[PDB]
Amino acid sequence: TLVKQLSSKFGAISSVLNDIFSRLDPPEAEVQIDRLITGRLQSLQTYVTQ
Amino acid sequence: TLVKQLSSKFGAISSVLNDIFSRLDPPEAEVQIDRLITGRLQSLQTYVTQ
Amino acid sequence: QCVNLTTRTQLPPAYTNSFTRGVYYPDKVFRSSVLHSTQDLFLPFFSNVTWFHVISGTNGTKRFDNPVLPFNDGVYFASIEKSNIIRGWIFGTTLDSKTQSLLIVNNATNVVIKVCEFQFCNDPFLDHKNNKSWMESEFRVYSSANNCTFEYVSQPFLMDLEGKQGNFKNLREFVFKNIDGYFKIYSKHTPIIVDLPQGFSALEPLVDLPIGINITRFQTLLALHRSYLTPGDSSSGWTAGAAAYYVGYLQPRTFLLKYNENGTITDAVDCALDPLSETKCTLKSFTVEKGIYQTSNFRVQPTESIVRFPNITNLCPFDEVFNATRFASVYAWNRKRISNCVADYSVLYNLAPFFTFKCYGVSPTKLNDLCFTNVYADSFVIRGDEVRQIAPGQTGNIADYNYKLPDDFTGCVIAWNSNKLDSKVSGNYNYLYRLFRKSNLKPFERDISTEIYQAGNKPCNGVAGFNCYFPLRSYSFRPTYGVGHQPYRVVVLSFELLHAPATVCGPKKSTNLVKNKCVNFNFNGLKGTGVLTESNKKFLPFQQFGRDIADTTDAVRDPQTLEILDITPCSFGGVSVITPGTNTSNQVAVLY
Amino acid sequence: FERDISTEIYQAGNKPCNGVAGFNCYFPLRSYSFRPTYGVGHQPYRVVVLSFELLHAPATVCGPKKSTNLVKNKCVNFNFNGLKGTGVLTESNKKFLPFQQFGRDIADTTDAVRDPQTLEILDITPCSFGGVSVITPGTNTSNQVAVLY
Amino acid sequence: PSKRSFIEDLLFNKVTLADAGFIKQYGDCLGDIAARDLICAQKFKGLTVL
Ligand SMILES: *[C@@H]1O[C@H](CO)[C@@H](O)[C@H](O)[C@H]1NC(C)=O
Ligand SMILES: *[C@@H]1O[C@H](CO)[C@@H](O)[C@H](O)[C@H]1NC(C)=O
Ligand SMILES: *[C@@H]1O[C@H](CO)[C@@H](O)[C@H](O)[C@H]1NC(C)=O
Numbered sequence A, B: 001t002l003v004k005q006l007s008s009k010f011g012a013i014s015s016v017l018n019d020i021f022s023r024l025d026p027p028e029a030e031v032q033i034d035r036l037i038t039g040r041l042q043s044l045q046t047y048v049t050q
Numbered sequence C: 001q002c003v004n005l006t007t008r009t010q011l012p013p014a015y016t017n018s019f020t021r022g023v024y025y026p027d028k029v030f031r032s033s034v035l036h037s038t039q040d041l042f043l044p045f046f047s048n049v050t051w052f053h054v055i056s057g058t059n060g061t062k063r064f065d066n067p068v069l070p071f072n073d074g075v076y077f078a079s080i081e082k083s084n085i086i087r088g089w090i091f092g093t094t095l096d097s098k099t100q101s102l103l104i105v106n107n108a109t110n111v112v113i114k115v116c117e118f119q120f121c122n123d124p125f126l127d128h129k130n131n132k133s134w135m136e137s138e139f140r141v142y143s144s145a146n147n148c149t150f151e152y153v154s155q156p157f158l159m160d161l162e163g164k165q166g167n168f169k170n171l172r173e174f175v176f177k178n179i180d181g182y183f184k185i186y187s188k189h190t191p192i193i194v195d196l197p198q199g200f201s202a203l204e205p206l207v208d209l210p211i212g213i214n215i216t217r218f219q220t221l222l223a224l225h226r227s228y229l230t231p232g233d234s235s236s237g238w239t240a241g242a243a244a245y246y247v248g249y250l251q252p253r254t255f256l257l258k259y260n261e262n263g264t265i266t267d268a269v270d271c272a273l274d275p276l277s278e279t280k281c282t283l284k285s286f287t288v289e290k291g292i293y294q295t296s297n298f299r300v301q302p303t304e305s306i307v308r309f310p311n312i313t314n315l316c317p318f319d320e321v322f323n324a325t326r327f328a329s330v331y332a333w334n335r336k337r338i339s340n341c342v343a344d345y346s347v348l349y350n351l352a353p354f355f356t357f358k359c360y361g362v363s364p365t366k367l368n369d370l371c372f373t374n375v376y377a378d379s380f381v382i383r384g385d386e387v388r389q390i391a392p393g394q395t396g397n398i399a400d401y402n403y404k405l406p407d408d409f410t411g412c413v414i415a416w417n418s419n420k421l422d423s424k425v426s427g428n429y430n431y432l433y434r435l436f437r438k439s440n441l442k443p444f445e446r447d448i449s450t451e452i453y454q455a456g457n458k459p460c461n462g463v464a465g466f467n468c469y470f471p472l473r474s475y476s477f478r479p480t481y482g483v484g485h486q487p488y489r490v491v492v493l494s495f496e497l498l499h500a501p502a503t504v505c506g507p508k509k510s511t512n513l514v515k516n517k518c519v520n521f522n523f524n525g526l527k528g529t530g531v532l533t534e535s536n537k538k539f540l541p542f543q544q545f546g547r548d549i550a551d552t553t554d555a556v557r558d559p560q561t562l563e564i565l566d567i568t569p570c571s572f573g574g575v576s577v578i579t580p581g582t583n584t585s586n587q588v589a590v591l592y
Numbered sequence D: 001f002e003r004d005i006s007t008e009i010y011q012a013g014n015k016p017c018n019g020v021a022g023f024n025c026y027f028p029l030r031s032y033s034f035r036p037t038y039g040v041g042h043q044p045y046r047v048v049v050l051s052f053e054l055l056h057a058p059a060t061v062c063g064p065k066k067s068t069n070l071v072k073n074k075c076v077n078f079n080f081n082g083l084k085g086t087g088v089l090t091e092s093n094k095k096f097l098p099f100q101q102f103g104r105d106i107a108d109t110t111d112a113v114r115d116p117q118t119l120e121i122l123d124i125t126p127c128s129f130g131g132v133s134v135i136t137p138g139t140n141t142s143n144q145v146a147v148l149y
Numbered sequence E: 001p002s003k004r005s006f007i008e009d010l011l012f013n014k015v016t017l018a019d020a021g022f023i024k025q026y027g028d029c030l031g032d033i034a035a036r037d038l039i040c041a042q043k044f045k046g047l048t049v050l
C-alpha cells in the first residue's frame, strides 16, 4: 500500500511530476509540487507510525 | 527536534508571523497563515503520538 | 416649538448590585439539552448599575431626572413602576443635530416610533397635561422639520397586560445595542415582586431597524404632569410622581448558556469572573468534581508602543526616473541605483489614467512602513501587447530574449500609457529590440550587440546576404493605431529583503526608547513584543542583530544610538485550580 | 457604513484660523469639473453599490421559481428557501418559539425547519443507509452466497 | 544529607547527567548574563517540565 499510494493525484492535475514541474508556469506548478510532496510525506509518516 | 522544526517555511513566504502580516494584505496573507498553522499543527501532533 | 429646561438638581449616583441579570437569546435558532457556549455582548455578572431615582415629589424641585448618559457599547435600561411613566428613549444621538436623531415614544393611542432628521432643540421634555386624555400637545424635543427618513407603528409593544394590583405590576427589561450598523432591541415583562430581584430570566428579541449613525450618548425622557394646581415656569412646572430605573453598560464577555427541554434558557455561568468559573467552563459542565484542573495561562500584556528608525531625511530621486524625457531601448534597459534617501510612494500615484501598479511579494499599500535595502529602478520602452508578457517565469519573445526576470522576484512593475509622447508625425523608430539571439538570456542580464550571425549556416561575417537576417528590428509606433500596438513605458522596482543593511525606507518618526518594561517595538520593521535590557554581549563592529538557538531574534542594535539590547518575553506561565468538589463547597485555591 | 452631513468649516490644525473663512482655512467641500470633451479618467460615471447579508432570519426576495406540493414520509430532496438536502420530512413535536425558524444539532445540521407557507415544523432524517458483508463458503465448493444488511 | 546509602550515592552520579528543568523560575534566566541554555530557550516556546 505504501508503494501503491505513490500514483495518486492528491488534489492536482496529474500524478506525474513531468507534466507539472515542466510545460507550465512557475507559481501554480510550485503549488502543485508542494501539495504532492506534503501528501507523500504524510503517507511516509503514517507508514512509519504503523 | 520539536524546537528545531519551528524554522521551516512549509512552502510559504517566511517562517515568522509578524513579517508575513506586515508585508501582505489579509486577502493573500490568509493562505500563508493557514499554511503555517497547518504545518505547525501537523508538526505538533506527531510528538504527542510518539 | 421648544422651551428650555431649568431647576437642575445634583444627587449622588446610588449604586446597587445586579445578581445575574441581562441574559438573552443570541441567535434565532432552536436548541435543546445542550450546553452551548456563546461569545457576544453580555452584562457582566455581579456588577453595580447606576440606580437613578425619581425624588422631590409635589412641586418643590422635581430633580433633573433625565440627564444625558454615555452610550459606549450597550445599555441595560430596566424599570420598576406602576403608573407607566418612563418612556421615550433617545439613544445613539449626538444631540447637536449632526445626523439622524432617534425617538421611540409609545403608550399613546398606539405604540409609534418617530425617526426624523430634525435639528435638535436645547432642552427636551415631553408634555402631558393632566386632563381626561393625556396627549403630547407640546413637542419640546424638537422644533424643526428639516428632513424625515422613517416612520413605523407597532400594535403589540410595552403594554402592561395585567390586572389591577397595588404592588409593582411590571419589571420591564431592555437591551439596546448596535449590531455593527443596525440597532437591535430585546425586551421582556416580569410579573409583580413583593432593587433588582434575584433570579434568572431570558429576553426575547424584537424589531430592529438599520439607521446607522455616529453615537455620542444616551438620553431618557419622562412624561410631564403639568396641572393648574401649581403656578410654575414653562421650563419645569409639573408634578414629579414616583419612578425608578436602572442603567448598565454592556461589555464583550464569554458565557456558557444552558438550554432546557422546551428549548428555553434556564441557567448560565459567566467566565472570567471567578477561579471556579472558567474551569466550570473548561470542563463544559455545571458540576465540578474534586481534584486539580488546568484552566489557562497568565501573561503580562504590553502597556506602551515604541518605534525607532534611521534619522535620515533626504528625499529619493523618483522624479527623473519617471519624468525622463527620453527612455532607452528594451535591450539597453538603463540600470539605476537608489540608496540613502527617504522614499515616499504616495507621490508616485500621480501618473496617466492607464495605470497597472500590481505587485508581487508585497501589498501595494504597505510600502511606507517597511524598510528596504538597495532599491533599484529600471526604465525601458516596450510594445503595448507585451506589457502583460513581462512577468516572473513567463515565456515569450520579449521575456526570453530581451529582459528576463527571476522566478523569486521581489518588487513590482509600473506601466503607464505613452500614446502621444513616443509617436511622431510619421512614427518613431529609435526604439529597437532583439528578434533573434543565440539562446535565452539569464535573469537580470544585459547584452547589446549588432553583429550579424549565421542564422542559416554559411556565416555571413558582415555580408548580411540571403539566409542572414538582421538581429535588431525597429518599432513603427504609429501616431494613431490599436492600443495593442501603441508604445508603453514600464519601470520595475526590484529590492532585496531580509533587512540586514537597512538603508532607505520612508517617513516613520522615532520615539524615546524605554527599557525594563513589557513593551512593543518596531526596530526597523521588526515588530515584536518583549522587554529591552542592556546587554553585556560583545558584538563585533560589523555585527547587526543577533540570534539564539532557534531562529528568533535575541539581540538588536539601536539604529540611532548604535547600542546592543536584549529582547525577552516579559511573563507567562500556567494556572491550576484546587477544588474540593461542587456539592460541598464553592471556594478554591489557585496554584501559579 | 457611516454618513455625515457636517457642513461646518473644518479647522486645519496647527495655527488654527478659528473657522472665520479667512486665511489658513480649509474648506473640504469642493465641486467636480465635468466637460463634454474631457479625459476618460475625469469623465463622469454613475456608481451603484448593493449589499446583502445571509442570516438565519426569514428571507425576503426569493424570486421567480416553482412551488410544488409538500410530501412526507419519503426520502426526497427539498429546496426550502436556500436550504438544500435530503430527508424524510416527517411531523415534529418541537415547540418553536415565535421568533425561531431553524433547528440545529451538535454537528450543526438543521434537524428541523419551518416551511414558508404552511407555517409548520418538520423533522429531517436522511432516510436509511448502511449494509455490507456478503457471506461465502469458499470458491472450490460453490458460488452461492448470502448477504447481511 | 538525606538517608541515601553508599550504593545509591554511587548510582545518583553515574546516570544523573541532566535533572532537566523541574520547574525553574523565570528569574533564573530573564536574559541576565550569557545564560540562554537549552532549558531556558525551550521554555520561551511553551514547552515546560512538571
Ligand atoms: C462599582 O464598584 C463599587 C462597588 O460598590 C462602587 O463603590 C463603585 O463606585 C462602582 N463603580 C466603579 C467604577 O467601581
Ligand atoms: C416543556 O413543555 C412541556 C409541554 O407540555 C411542558 O409540559 C413542560 O413543563 C416543559 N418543560 C419544563 C421544564 O417546563
Ligand atoms: C542621527 O544619526 C547619527 C548616525 O549614527 C547619530 O550619530 C546621531 O546621534 C543621530 N542624531 C540624533 C539626534 O539622534
Ligand SMILES: *[C@@H]1O[C@H](CO)[C@@H](O)[C@H](O)[C@H]1NC(C)=O
Pocket: C318, C319, C322, C323, C347, C348, C350, C351
Ligand atoms: C512628472 O511629470 C508630471 C507631469 O509633468 C508631474 O505631475 C509629476 O509630479 C512629475 N513627477 C513624477 C514623479 O511623476
Ligand SMILES: *[C@@H]1O[C@H](CO)[C@@H](O)[C@H](O)[C@H]1NC(C)=O
Pocket: C289, C581, C582, C583, C584
Ligand atoms: C459530592 O460528590 C462526590 C462525588 O460523587 C461524592 O463522593 C460526595 O459524597 C458528594 N458530597 C455530598 C453528597 O455531600
Ligand SMILES: *[C@@H]1O[C@H](CO)[C@@H](O)[C@H](O)[C@H]1NC(C)=O
Pocket: D116, D117, D118
Ligand atoms: C400562499 O399562496 C397560496 C394561496 O394564496 C396558498 O399556498 C397559501 O394559502 C398561501 N400562504 C399563505 C401563508 O397565505
